[PDB]
Design a binder for this molecule. Structure first.
Ligand SMILES: */C=C/C(=O)Nc1ccccc1Oc1nc(Nc2cnn(C)c2)ncc1Cl
Length: 269
């Protein structure tokens, strides 16, 4: 089904303030996108409400990328938020993978396409990118849903460290592609829990078959939230920001896992 429908407000980006727009050349790319959006319905995916145009829900928080790296002042967030964000992301992507008749692939998963609402607590998927792109994709191979798992792995490293992936490399896109294709991955995280480290490295394996499914990622992340309480708390506290460059191929995390090891000790010991 598809609902039919406003006061046009100030422009937000390149799309005004929930709307989007056609540029009549994109009228064909528009039809391919709308047909699939009407079939999709999920909490962690953006809600769609003459001339040709859409009406999405206006996420006041903006993109996850803007929250993590955008204009100051940036908000404070915890390990709970970071894990919750990645959990809700894998929930929405799993919905797309588990779709009949054909499994819908997102292809371009990255924080700039992940919106936040309800005080930065609820994450929603919204259908340059070399940092999050799986190696088999930009080489020109028969890629599959497992390329979204690679992207998720990079996003997991990104919210924990609050670092732009492959910012040390920089340059044009082909320089990042060359690195990822040769095997370079983001540096490991200091004092990162072994369960999280294991899921992250698996998610960005060279061989796509060795990466876990999104259903497996959701289930694992759901059981880990037991040890990450406080994801419902809205973001409201400021954050004065200084980043130390990570020498010797190892970086410090932004979030703090102290509470995780504490709660983990109670159950296991
Ligand atoms: C879903 C992809 C996406 O984020 N597209 C996009 C990019 C830039 C600006 C707006 C926009 O679309 C949306 N933005 C927002 N909120 C918002 C507030 N300020 N900015 C920059 C974005 N909410 C929903 C959408 Cl579809």
């Amino acid at each position: 089904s598809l609902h039919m429908i406003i006061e046009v407000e100030e422009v937000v980006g390149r799309v005004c303030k929930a709307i989007k727009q056609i540029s009549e050349s994109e009228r064909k790319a528009f039809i391919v996108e709308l047909r699939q959006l009407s079939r999709v319905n999920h909490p962690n995916i953006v809600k769609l409400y003459n001339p040709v145009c859409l009406v999405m829900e206006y996420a006041e928080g903006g993109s996850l990328y803007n929250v993590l790296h955008g204009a100051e002042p940036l908000p404070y967030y915890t390990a709970a938020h970071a894990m919750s964000w990645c959990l809700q992301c894998s929930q929405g992507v799993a919905y797309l993978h588990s779709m009949q008749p054909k499994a819908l692939i997102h292809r371009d998963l990255k924080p700039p396409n992940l919106l936040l609402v309800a005080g930065g607590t609820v994450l929603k998927i919204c259908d340059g990118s070399a940092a999050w792109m799986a190696p088999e994709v930009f080489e020109g191979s028969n890629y599959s849903e497992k390329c979204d798992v690679f992207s998720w792995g990079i996003i997991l490293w990104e919210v924990i460290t609050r670092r732009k992936p492959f910012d040390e490399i920089g340059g044009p896109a082909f320089r990042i592609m060359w690195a990822v294709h040769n095997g370079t991955r983001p540096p490991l995280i200091k004092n990162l829990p072994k369960p999280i480290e294991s899921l992250m490295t698996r998610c960005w394996s060279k061989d796509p078959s060795q990466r876990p499914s999104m259903e497996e990622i959701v289930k694992i992340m759901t059981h880990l939230m037991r040890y990450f309480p406080g994801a419902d708390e809205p973001l409201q506290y400021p954050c004065q920001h200084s980043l130390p460059p990570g020498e010797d191929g190892r970086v410090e995390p932004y979030v703090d896992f102290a509470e995780f090891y504490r709660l983990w000790s109670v159950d296991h010991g």
